[PDB]
Amino acid sequence: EEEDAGLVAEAEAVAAGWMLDFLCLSLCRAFRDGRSEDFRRTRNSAEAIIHGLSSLTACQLRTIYICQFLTRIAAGKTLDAQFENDERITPLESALMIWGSIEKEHDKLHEEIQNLIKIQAIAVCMENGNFKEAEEVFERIFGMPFKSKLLMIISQKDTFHSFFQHFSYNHMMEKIKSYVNYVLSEKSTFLMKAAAKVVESKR
Amino acid sequence: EEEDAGLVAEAEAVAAGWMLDFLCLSLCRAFRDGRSEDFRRTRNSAEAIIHGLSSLTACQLRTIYICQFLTRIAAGKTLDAQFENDERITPLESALMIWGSIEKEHDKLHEEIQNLIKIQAIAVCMENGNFKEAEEVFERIFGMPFKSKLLMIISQKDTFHSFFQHFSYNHMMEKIKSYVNYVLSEKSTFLMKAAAKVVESKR
Ligand SMILES: O=C1CC(I)=CC=N1
Ligand SMILES: O=C1CC(I)=CC=N1
C-alpha cells in the first residue's frame, strides 16, 4: 500500500534525471549555434528541473558544472551579473573557477580557454572605463607569465589595445564552442534518441 | 546540410511535449496527495517548459487549462494573488472561469465543484473582513438560485456562518481531488511509463 507512493517517487526521479540530461545537452547545442534566446529559455528549464531533484550522480553534477560555466561565459560582458556570494567576483572570474575545478583532462585546448578567459576578465573592465576594477580582478587572477603585459595595459588605460585584439572575445567564444562541439560528439541521451526515432518515423 | 538543424529542432519539440505531459501529470498527483511544496516546484518546471514550446495540440492545451485551474484553487485563500490583467479578479474567480470554459462533460460532479468554488469565492472575502469585496465578487458571479442566502450573509457580516460550514473549503478541495483522481485513471505517458519500467527492472 505505502510502497505504491515510493514506486511513483522513484519513477519521477528517473524521469527527472532524463529531463536534466536532455536540457543540459540542448543548452550545449544552443550555445554552440549562438541561439541566445533558446539558451536563455533552456537555462530557465534546467534550473527549475534541478530544484525538483534530490539525488545526483557525479556525471549529472559534472554536467551541471559545464552548463553553469556556459551561462557565466554568456554573461561575461554583463558586468552587472553576480553568480556567487562575493559580489565583487565578475562573471568571467566565476566561469574561470568552474573551469579550473571540473574533473576534466587538462589538455592544450583546456589551457588555451583558461588563458583566454583570464585576459578577457580584465579586458571587459577596461572596455567600460572601470580601470580600478581591472586592477582588482588582476590581483585575484595573478598572485600565467604574461601578467607584465596586462598590468602595463591597466596602468596605461589603453582601452582599444592591440593585445586584446589577438586574444579577442570572439576567439575565447570560438575556442569554447570547439569544446562544446567535442563533448556533444561524446554526448545519445535516452530522451533525445527516443524523440529522434519519432521524427525519423514521420519521414 | 540545413535539414540537420530542422531534425534536431523537431526532436526537441517531441521531447518537450513529453516533458510537458509528464509534468502536468506529476502536478495532478501532487495536488491530489496534498504535497504542497512538490506542487509548487512542479508548477515552476511546467511553466518554464511551456515557454520553451511553440506548438501545442488541443490535448496539451486542455491539460494546461486543468493545471492552471489547480494552481488557482491552491491560491484560493491567497487574496493577494493576481492571475489575470484585471487585478480585481480574486484567485477563486479565475479558477471558476477556466472550469466553466474547459471542453469537458458537464456532469453532476462538475456542477457541484462549480457551485462550491462560487460559495468559497465570497466566503474567503468575509473570512478576512473584506465585506465590500465579497459584495463586488458576488455581483460578478450572480447576475445559481442560492444567491438570496449569500447576499443576506454578506449584508449581515457574519464571518463564522453556518452556511459556509456545510459548503466548506475542505469540501470544495475534496470534490476537486476526486476529479483529479478520475482524470489520472484516464491518464500512461511516454515518460512516466518508461521510468516505471526502469524502477520495476531494479526490483
Ligand atoms: O543551476 C544551473 C544549472 C544549469 I544545467 C545551468 C545553469 N545553472
Ligand atoms: O502556465 C501554467 C502552466 C501550468 I501546466 C500550470 C500553471 N501555469
Residue numbers in the entry:
A (entry chain A), B (entry chain A): 60 to 202, 208 to 251, 253 to 268
Which of the paper's sentences describe this entry?
TRF1 is a subunit of the shelterin complex that binds to and protects the linear ends of chromosomes known as telomeres. TRF1 binds to double-stranded telomeric repeats and mediates telomere protection, replication and extension. It is recruited to shelterin through a domain:peptide interaction between its TRF homology (TRFH) domain, also responsible for dimerisation of TRF1 (TRF1TRFH), and a short linear motif of TIN2, known as its TRFH-binding motif or TBM (TIN2TBM). Here, we report the discovery of a series of fragment hits that bind at the interface between the TRFH domain of TRF1 (TRF1TRFH) and a peptide of TIN2 (TIN2TBM), an interaction essential for the recruitment of TRF1 to shelterin, using X-ray crystallography (XChem) and ligand-observed NMR (LO-NMR) fragment screening.
To find a different crystal form of TRF1TRFH, we carried out a series of commercially available crystallisation screens and identified conditions that generated crystals in the P41212 space group, different from the original P3121 crystal system. An initial inspection of the TIN2TBM site showed that the closest neighbouring TRF1TRFH molecule in this new crystal was further away than in the previous crystal system, this time exposing both the TIN2 leucine and phenylalanine binding pockets to the solvent. Furthermore, the loop region adjacent to the leucine pocket that typically accommodates three arginine residues of TIN2 was well-resolved and closely resembled that of the published TRF1:TIN2 co-crystal structure; this was in contrast to the previous crystal system, in which F142 formed a cation-pi interaction with the sidechain of R131. In light of this, we carried out a second XChem fragment screen against the new crystal system of TRF1TRFH. PanDDA analysis of the 981 processable datasets resulted in 50 hits being identified across different sites of the protein, 28 of which were found in the TIN2TBM binding site. After refinement of the 28 PanDDA hits, 19 could be confidently assigned in the conventional electron density maps. However, unlike the hits obtained from the P3121 XChem screen, the hits from the P41212 XChem screen spanned a larger surface area of the TIN2TBM binding site, and most did not appear to form any interactions with TRF1TRFH molecules from neighbouring asymmetric units. This diversity of hit matter covering the leucine pocket and the phenylalanine pocket of the TIN2TBM peptide will provide a firm starting point for efforts aimed at linking and merging hits. Interestingly, several fragment hits originating from our second XChem screen possess alternative groups to the sulfonic acid that interact with R131 and R102, which opens up opportunities to link and merge hit matter found across the TIN2 leucine and phenylalanine binding pockets.
